[PDB]
Amino acid sequence: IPNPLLGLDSTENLYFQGIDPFTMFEEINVVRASQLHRRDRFDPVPELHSLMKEGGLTVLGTEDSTEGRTAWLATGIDEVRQVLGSDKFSARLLYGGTAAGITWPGFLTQYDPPEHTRLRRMVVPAFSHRRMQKFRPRVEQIVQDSLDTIESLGGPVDFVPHFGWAIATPATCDFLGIPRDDQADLARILLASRTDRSDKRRTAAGNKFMTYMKQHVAQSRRGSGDDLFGIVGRENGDAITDAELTGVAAFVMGAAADQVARLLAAGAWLMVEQPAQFALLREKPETVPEWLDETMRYLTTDEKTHPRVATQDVRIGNQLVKAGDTVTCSLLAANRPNYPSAEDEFDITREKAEHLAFGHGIHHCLGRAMAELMFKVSIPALAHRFPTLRLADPQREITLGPPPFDVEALLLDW
Ligand code: HEM
């Protein structure tokens, strides 16, 4: 029971007779983790910078009950790696007990070994470095088309739709063999499922997409395409279900496509904030072999991992994480440990900049090679195309939305 006589926070004060206390505990902690992972331009916010100084593992929240659950945040790189690499944490148990089945088939984030291992192993070959090599020429074409469209319009141009989304939509669609004629309507439907203010209309749109995708999966899984479905379906036959394939594909075009768009927008913004450094990339790329890793480290566009649930008591760094506790890992804190300082600042010329922008352990980003391909093609292509790229209005702050790193609009001229 919150006490609204004492405090002002709306989220913490929400109460009505018959409210679920556990739900409120979970939701408040999610809100806290989210607030901590907003950004101050490219930087951690002061609240996270402060929290980081406290130690490598801190309490986000601790339930009203005697012997109730604690939600933890891991910020130290050692603690983050330890939690994410441990077999004593579950991802599945975040969504229900041992009894509860899979809620969203193909949502790998939600599986534990052994079934996480089998499903990921089945879908892995479609996401390989070799497979991305084969995909590069198509990505290069997508990027040039987008730059052509930008140039043809004239500045100012909003790089969120015209760069991030203009690349992410066709790239993710092409990867799944989605016919060119279907892609614009699908992107529109996905927009509605991500943003519509009516939850009812949001669900209708989501269902419309999943219906299309289920049909596409059934059509493609036994055919001869180089799309995800042909590859995985030909290789695995009936061992992978239509629902599992639908789930994987939907993540690629849904959530993951949003991530790529957000990364590309954040990248374009960094280029106009650090033009001398990216001039080095376009004119002498050989002198900056590790530019990609440094950029990923600095940007950390996926600030935090999904909470993991302790399956038994476990020592993390110095603390005791009790069975049933959750730990959320701050990839942002792990990647920016020395913020602020000269050494933390973006430096394109740095030695092999090591980072956890794509996570760690068994759940590490399946699409890392794809995301990297996207970025390694798009950013240099943009730099060469528009060397004079700048903010249309240097006086105006860039508006950032809720995490993950969410550039709402990026008006650039050249
Ligand atoms: C289209 C490109 C992408 C695809 C297809 C993709 C796909 C995936 C999938 C399927 C997972 C779950 C893997 C598992 O649980 O075994 C995952 C995890 C993850 N991805 Fe991506 N991803 C993409 C882009 C990105 C980007 C741009 C970032 C930002 C750096 C990112 C960061 C992460 C992180 C941090 C995790 C681990 C989450 C956790 O441990 O809770 N991904 N990715």
Tokens of 237: 């036959």
User: Which residues touch 312 (CB under 8 Å, ≥6 apart)?
Assistant: 88, 323
Contact yes or no for 48/330 (Cβ under 8 A): yes
Q: Is 44 in contact with 332 (CB distance < 8 Å)?
A: yes
CA distance 333 to 339: 9
Residue 146 one-letter amino acid: S
Q: What's the CA-to-centroid distance between 347 and ligand 1, angstroms?
A: 25
154: Cα separation from own chain's centroid: 31
**Probe ligand 1: pick from 127, 365, 406, max atoms within 8 Å of CB?**
365
Q: Is the dihedral of CA 244, 358, 363, 109 positive or negative?
A: negative
The DSSP H or E segment spanning 127 is none
Neighbours of 345 (CB within 10 A): 14
194 CB burial (10 A radius; 0-12, 13-18, 19+): middle
Method used to obtain the model: X-ray
Task: Quote the DSSP letter at residue 367.
Answer: T
Strands 390-391 and 89-90: unpaired
Q: Is 37 annotated as a binding residue?
A: no
Give residue 278 CA to ligand 1 midpoint distance, Å.
Answer: 26
Closest CA to 385 of 170, 140, 161: 140
Q: Is 222 a known ligand-binding residue?
A: no
Please report which residue ranges of 86-182 form alpha helices under DSSP H. 115-123, 129-153, 159, 166-175
User: Is 173 assigned to a binding site?
Assistant: no
Structure tokens at 261: 């768009």
Alpha-carbon distance 414 to 385, whole Å?
10
Coil vs helix vs strand at 179: coil
- Other Cβ atoms closer than 10 A to 79: 26
The two structure tokens encoding residue 277: 């450094």
Torsion of CA 255, 261, 263, 269, to 10 degrees: -150
How far is the C-alpha of 68 from the C-alpha of 346, rounded, in Å?
Answer: 42
Reference 74, options 292, 295, 328; nearest CA is 328
**Whole-number Å distance between alpha carbons of 329 and 332:** 9
User: Domain with 348 in it: what CATH number?
Assistant: 1.10.630.10
Query: Is 396 annotated as belonging to a binding site?
Result: no
Beta strands 70-74 and 326-329, pairing class: parallel
Of all atoms in ligand 1, which is nearest to the CA of residue 306? 41
- Secondary structure element (H or E) that encloses residue 73, with its range: strand 70-74
Indicate the residue type of 263.
L
If one counts every other C-beta atom within 10 angstroms of the C-beta of residue 359, the result is 18
The candidate with the shortest Cα–Cα distance to 259, out of 106, 123, 404, is 404
How many CB atoms sit inside 10 A of residue 252's CB?
23
Count the neighbouring beta carbons within 10 Å of the beta carbon of residue 247. 23
Q: Which residues does a 6 A CB cutoff place in the pocket of ligand 1?
A: 108-109, 120, 172, 251-252, 256, 259-260, 263, 301-302, 305-306, 331, 357-359, 363, 365-367, 370-371
What's the one-letter identity of residue 63?
E
Nearest ligand 1 atom, CA 123: 10
Strand order in the sheet with 70-74: 57-62, 70-74, 326-329, 308-310, 89-90
For residue 192, the one-letter residue type is A
289 C-beta neighbours (distance < 10 Å), count: 11
Distance CA 33, CA 57 (A): 13
Question: Residue whose CA is closest, atom 9 of ligand 1?
Answer: 366
In this structure, are residues 159 and 391 in contact, taking their beta carbons and an 8 Å threshold? no
Torsion, Cα 296 298 299 304, to 10 degrees, reads: 90
Helix, strand, coil content of the chain in percent (nearest 5)? 55, 10, 35
Helix (H, G, I), strand (E, B) or coil at 400: strand
Residue 226: count of CB within 10 angstroms of its CB: 14
Per DSSP, what are the bridge partners of residue 321? Answer: 314
In 196-304, alpha helices (H)? 199-220, 228-236, 242-253, 255-273, 275-283, 291-299
User: Hey, what amino acid is at 150?
Assistant: I
List the beta bridge partners of residue 310: 89
Structure tokens at 215: 């049909």
Encoded tokens for 340: 């602020």
Note the residue count of the chain. Answer: 414
**How far, in Å, from the CA of 298 to the mean position of ligand 1?**
17
Q: Measure the CA–CA gap between 206 and 214, rounded to whole angstroms.
A: 12
Using DSSP, how many helices (H) and how many strands (E) does the chain show?
17, 12
HSE-up of residue 301 (Cα within 13 Å, Cβ side)? 25
Ligand 1: atom nearest CA of 260 is 27
Among protein residues, the one with the nearest Cα to ligand 1's atom 36 is 365
Residue 17's φ and ψ, nearest 5 degrees, are: -55, 125
Nearest CA owner, ligand 1 atom 19: 365
The Å distance, Cα 256 to ligand 1 centre, comes to 7
C-alpha 262 chain-centroid distance: 9
Say how many domains are in the chain: 1
DSSP 348: T
Phi and psi at residue 133, in whole multiples of 5°?
A: -55, -50
Phi/psi at 381 (nearest 5 deg)? -65, -40
Q: From the CA of 368, how far away is ligand 1's center (Å)? A: 7
Atom of ligand 1 nearest to the CA of 357: 30
Ligand 1 geometric centre to CA of 366 (Å): 6
- Exposed, middle or buried: residue 414 (CB in 10 Å: 0-12, 13-18, 19+)? middle
Nearest-atom number in ligand 1 for the CA of 252 is 5
Taking alpha carbons only, the member of 48, 102, 88 closest to residue 326 is 88
Protein residue whose Cα sits closest to atom 16 of ligand 1: 363
- 201 annotated to a ligand binding site: no
The pair of three-digit structure tokens given for residue 241, joined into one six-digit string:
């279900």
- Three-state DSSP state, 345: coil
Measured in Å, residue 276 CA sits from the centre of ligand 1 at 31
Q: DSSP labels for 24-72? A: HHHHHHHHHHHHTT-EETTEE-HHHHHHHHT-SEEEEEE-SSTT--EEE
For residues 333 and 327, the answer to whether their CB atoms sit within 8 Å is no
Contacts of 170 (CB under 8 A, 6+ apart): 142, 183
Atom of ligand 1 nearest to the CA of 364: 37
Q: Between the CA of residue 56 and those of 3, 60, 326, what are the distances in Å?
A: 31, 13, 15
Element (H, E) at 77: helix 77-85
Handedness of CA 338, 341, 347, 351 (dihedral sign): negative
- Which DSSP string do the residues of 376-399 spell out, in sequence order? HHHHHHHHHH-TT-EES-TTSPPP
Separation between Cα atoms, residue 301 and residue 260, nearest integer Å: 9
Q: Is 162 annotated as a binding residue?
A: no
Q: 44 pairs with which residues across the strands?
A: 39
Amino acid identity of residue 81, one-letter, is: R
Domain of residue 34 covers 1-414
Euclidean distance between the first and final Cα of the chain, in Å? 56
Tell how far the Cα of 116 is from the centroid of ligand 1, in angstroms: 14
Measured in angstroms, how far is the CA atom of residue 396 from the centroid of ligand 1? 32
